[PDB]
Amino acid sequence: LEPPPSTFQPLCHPLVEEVSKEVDGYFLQHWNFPNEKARKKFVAAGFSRVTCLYFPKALDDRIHFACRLLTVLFLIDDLLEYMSFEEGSAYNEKLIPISRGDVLPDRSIPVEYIIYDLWESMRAHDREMADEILEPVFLFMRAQTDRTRARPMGLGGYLEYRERDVGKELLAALMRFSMGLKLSPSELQRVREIDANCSKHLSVVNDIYSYEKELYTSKTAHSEGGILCTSVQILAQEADVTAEAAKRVLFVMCREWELRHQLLVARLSAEGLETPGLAAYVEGLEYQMSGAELWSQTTLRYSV
Amino acid sequence: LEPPPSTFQPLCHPLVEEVSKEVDGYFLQHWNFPNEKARKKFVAAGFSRVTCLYFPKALDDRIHFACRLLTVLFLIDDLLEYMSFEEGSAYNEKLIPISRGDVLPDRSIPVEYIIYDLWESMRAHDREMADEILEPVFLFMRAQTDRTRARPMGLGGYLEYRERDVGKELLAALMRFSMGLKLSPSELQRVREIDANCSKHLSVVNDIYSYEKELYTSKTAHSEGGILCTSVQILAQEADVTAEAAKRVLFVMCREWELRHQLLVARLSAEGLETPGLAAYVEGLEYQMSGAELWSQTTLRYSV
Amino acid sequence: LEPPPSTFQPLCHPLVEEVSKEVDGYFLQHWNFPNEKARKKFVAAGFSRVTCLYFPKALDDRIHFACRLLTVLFLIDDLLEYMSFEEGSAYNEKLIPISRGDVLPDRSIPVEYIIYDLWESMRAHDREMADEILEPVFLFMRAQTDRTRARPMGLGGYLEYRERDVGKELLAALMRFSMGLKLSPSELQRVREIDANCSKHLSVVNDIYSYEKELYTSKTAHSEGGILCTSVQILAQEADVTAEAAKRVLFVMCREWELRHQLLVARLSAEGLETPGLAAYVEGLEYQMSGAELWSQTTLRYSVV
Amino acid sequence: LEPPPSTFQPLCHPLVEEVSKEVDGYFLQHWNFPNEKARKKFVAAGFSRVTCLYFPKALDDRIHFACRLLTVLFLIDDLLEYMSFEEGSAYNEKLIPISRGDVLPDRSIPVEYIIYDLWESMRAHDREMADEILEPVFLFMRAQTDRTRARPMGLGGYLEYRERDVGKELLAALMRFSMGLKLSPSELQRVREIDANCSKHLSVVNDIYSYEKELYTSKTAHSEGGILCTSVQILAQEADVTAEAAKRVLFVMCREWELRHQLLVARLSAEGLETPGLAAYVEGLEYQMSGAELWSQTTLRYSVV
Numbered sequence A, B: 001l002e003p004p005p006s007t008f009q010p011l012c013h014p015l016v017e018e019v020s021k022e023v024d025g026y027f028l029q030h031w032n033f034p035n036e037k038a039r040k041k042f043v044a045a046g047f048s049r050v051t052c053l054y055f056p057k058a059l060d061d062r063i064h065f066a067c068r069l070l071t072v073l074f075l076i077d078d079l080l081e082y083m084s085f086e087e088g089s090a091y092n093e094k095l096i097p098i099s100r101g102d103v104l105p106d107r108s109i110p111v112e113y114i115i116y117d118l119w120e121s122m123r124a125h126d127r128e129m130a131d132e133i134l135e136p137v138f139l140f141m142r143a144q145t146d147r148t149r150a151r152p153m154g155l156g157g158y159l160e161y162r163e164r165d166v167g168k169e170l171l172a173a174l175m176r177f178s179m180g181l182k183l184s185p186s187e188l189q190r191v192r193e194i195d196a197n198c199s200k201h202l203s204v205v206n207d208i209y210s211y212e213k214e215l216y217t218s219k220t221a222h223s224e225g226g227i228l229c230t231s232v233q234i235l236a237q238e239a240d241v242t243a244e245a246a247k248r249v250l251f252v253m254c255r256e257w258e259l260r261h262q263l264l265v266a267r268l269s270a271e272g273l274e275t276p277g278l279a280a281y282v283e284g285l286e287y288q289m290s291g292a293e294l295w296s297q298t299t300l301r302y303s304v
Numbered sequence C, D: 001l002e003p004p005p006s007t008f009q010p011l012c013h014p015l016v017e018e019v020s021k022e023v024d025g026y027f028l029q030h031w032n033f034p035n036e037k038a039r040k041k042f043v044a045a046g047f048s049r050v051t052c053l054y055f056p057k058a059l060d061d062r063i064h065f066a067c068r069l070l071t072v073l074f075l076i077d078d079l080l081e082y083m084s085f086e087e088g089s090a091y092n093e094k095l096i097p098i099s100r101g102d103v104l105p106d107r108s109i110p111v112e113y114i115i116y117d118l119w120e121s122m123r124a125h126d127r128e129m130a131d132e133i134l135e136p137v138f139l140f141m142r143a144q145t146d147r148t149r150a151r152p153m154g155l156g157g158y159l160e161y162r163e164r165d166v167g168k169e170l171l172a173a174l175m176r177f178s179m180g181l182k183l184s185p186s187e188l189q190r191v192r193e194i195d196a197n198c199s200k201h202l203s204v205v206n207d208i209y210s211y212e213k214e215l216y217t218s219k220t221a222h223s224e225g226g227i228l229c230t231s232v233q234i235l236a237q238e239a240d241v242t243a244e245a246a247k248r249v250l251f252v253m254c255r256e257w258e259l260r261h262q263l264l265v266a267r268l269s270a271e272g273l274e275t276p277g278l279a280a281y282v283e284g285l286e287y288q289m290s291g292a293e294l295w296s297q298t299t300l301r302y303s304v305v
Ligand SMILES: CC(C)=CCC/C(C)=C/CC/C(C)=C/CSP(=O)(O)OP(=O)(O)O
Pocket: A050, A070, A071, A073, A074, A077, A140, A165, A166, A167, A171, A202, A206, A207, A210, A292, A296
């Protein structure tokens, strides 16, 4: 597997090792892992490492919140693969009022009190920015168990749906939270098209590198929760080629989205619409894209 | 054309007579109408009346801003029908920096100074709420000359496009501006699905009532600006029936979206999630749907 | 679900009881039902009753052939849901040379010899007309396992696909067979538009009533054979409404195809191209539409999943 | 637009200069061109040259038939752009009985007598093989004015339609005619998957190079005949990228179909299924793909709109 060249350069948060020990340690203490092999696999994935590659300009005293939130969403993402759509939906819906702080957790259930304590701690740190991450998380949670996953999709309809299932909007809100980067609604409206393009890049890069994992899951886990729903197989079907061939084509499409990103940002700036906040934001998106790809290329999660 | 029953009751702003006189009078003074027949056709349309049906709970001192904005948008909407997509786009793009206040108007050109003065006066009245209307308007302007109008579309793809072409988002921000109704990003995220449903209703009710007008325009106006792009045609073509039959089917679909609106709002309230600002906002959407329909049923713009 | 008003009036073939008892009796003797519950459910479907609603002016000595063919196709229709498209296709292709009479059945396999004996008997009664049903049937059969069921479709593309999957053309050739109604190659060209419209009505009325059944199936059968492919779901997702809402909208669309049927018919008559042969056929198409709907409204196949 | 690497070597028929002169000469005498500009454009397109790249192993005394047939189909393809679907359908349907030899041409109407005389001369040369090109040509002609061109299509649905509109099957029959290559029904059935794959390549390579021409047509010609129906626009819309970006992505997918052609061919041979006639046939398909691309990269038809 050979990626075509990219002009995007990744960056990693300076505190990645100390924060990853802190956050890995918290989940190894509290989360219900089934056995030692699963604990080792959890550490091998490097979930705080992908968080620190996503948000390398996070404030030093906020990056750990983002590591915790992405880590617990990954752990849940993997649990849902053993559930039906209905079970998975019941599982996520329990957590939504708890995330809001509206329902207290059952403290004998780690996922509930981990979720409750985390969002309470983020609101204590910055209430307004924390509150802006909630509905984007819920939108993602609901997409994860959407029966649209078991229905035929074309490439266009898939990318529209995958924007939610890849958590693009929660990642943008979490990036802003992590950086203390406040943007007005008018500013956010200005970069809507840049966001949508970025979402496709994140989606398809993840699909390419995680395909062998997902293929294996689809054959071994729950026929609904584990269902293969990915651009790799949607393009392979549409073009009647192999998955390997579809990945080569999708990679080339990913570099076209990187070019489009650069063009859209250049236009924003030329029209005099790139504020200091927006400049930081679109550079932030570029780190998400290159950081996700660097982690995807190297994590044991996808290679074993 | 027999409208299926509806539980939505329309409401009109109490100041409709006074404001209509004022705003109609302003455009009759400044807008370059080509002849007397057009001046009469302008008055006959009742553009301030549809605004007052749209925002019946607007603050007494803000409703005229809304009448002016929708009036000038309607006037431009009609001029664009006689231009190419390329000519329309150049026309609209010139007005966008002027709307932002970044570029002074040529005061010998009425659309330029009307646009400049209007936005300057809105920002003087409420800077932050006025600024939230700008990108929604520009989104709508750019939809009007999108070459996607000249290409095949199914009902789903069309509704997604029409959401921009009908100005759903600018109407929402304009409603909020006009009521002084401030909503947080989190509140707005909670009603995203309610907004999307409402958009379909506005789009298709307009398509139904404005069909004879748009058909006539497609036969006599510019080949691009006049191109017929509407749910009436799309459904007739997909189902292989007449435009008349398609309207009767679309009308039933509109009442289904009304029921869905009620369901979605009831769920929002049943969860603990309908804030007082949200309650005002979703009520406001219901006025928009019923008000648009009432105007569309009665305006001379559509019957002659 | 309250149907909207209709001007079409259904008719049932006079001999419905006799032929039902006869043909149900034949399949209860010969078909490989898995258990007693399945035998009771088969009887509850009333497959001979829908045949008698579809072709109420069939000749008295021909109607049983049509009940047999539609019964065995319904039965295979249900089996294919538990197969891959490849398995399903292999199953059907096996029956095609057998239906032609070119290949002997394995008499230890009831579907093969039931199909074999059926077609033999039909050609024995009217070789010319029986032969006209064959390619229509194979068309329909190949549609059933068409991988295009596993591809995204809008409503227009769906209706063109459904024409084959709902068996419009085999119902036409069967209707004609069962009535002794012969039509010239010229007469059949004139009604190609009336046919396409009628296919939409059969397709969608079935979609509406069979939705709950097909939904259950899409959750419990084979990921390919059982895949949900229906106008109710296509409209629900295109318009963002519930399945129940899409059913109410589609039903109104059905009534418009009815009005359009009447229009295309008068139009054929006003031009005077309405032959006596063509006139019986389009009245027969109207019986198919209204009969299909009456059966669908009442059959336990659709109300008890 | 730099084409990505290919392992295919295009070949050109050795009589290309002599046959181009003969066949261009014939159409310049008989066809009604609207002006001198159109006559020069015709010669610049080099329609005998694409024929000779498509079929470089054609028999020396048959290559001119293929050149004539593809030339007149290109000319008609362009005329249809100024017509409605209904007008173009009537136009094509008039030619079908004449192609068959069943109806005499109006000798004052060049398209009619050029088509009549050409198909008569092909049947005079090799009746059985000429006749096998007819239904593939008609299939293509009816695809050209098919309403589905005005309905939304995703990539998979489009490629399925474009197999007919690109004339894949007529090109295969014409290749076999021109090489005197006779295949059994069994041999033909064996290569269906190879055929389907090759069709996507022809289709998309053509879409890539002809996009600027077709875009201009869609802005200036008939709203139906001139309608933009192409993978370039479909992918640009689905992926949200520019047309140029879509072309670069689609070109990489064309090389994947080249690789897949090679794999299918290997497998045919690895099983026991590759005959001498099949080997010549699938090698001929490779020349079609590389030849069509080489012509498309260099013809003024696509670079000067
Ligand atoms: C895209 C990426 C590397 C990281 C996104 C970072 C995270 C955790 C975002 C939260 C939303 C989730 C869990 C997306 C996983 S997409 P998926 O289910 O396809 O991920 P998988 O392939 O299972 O690793």
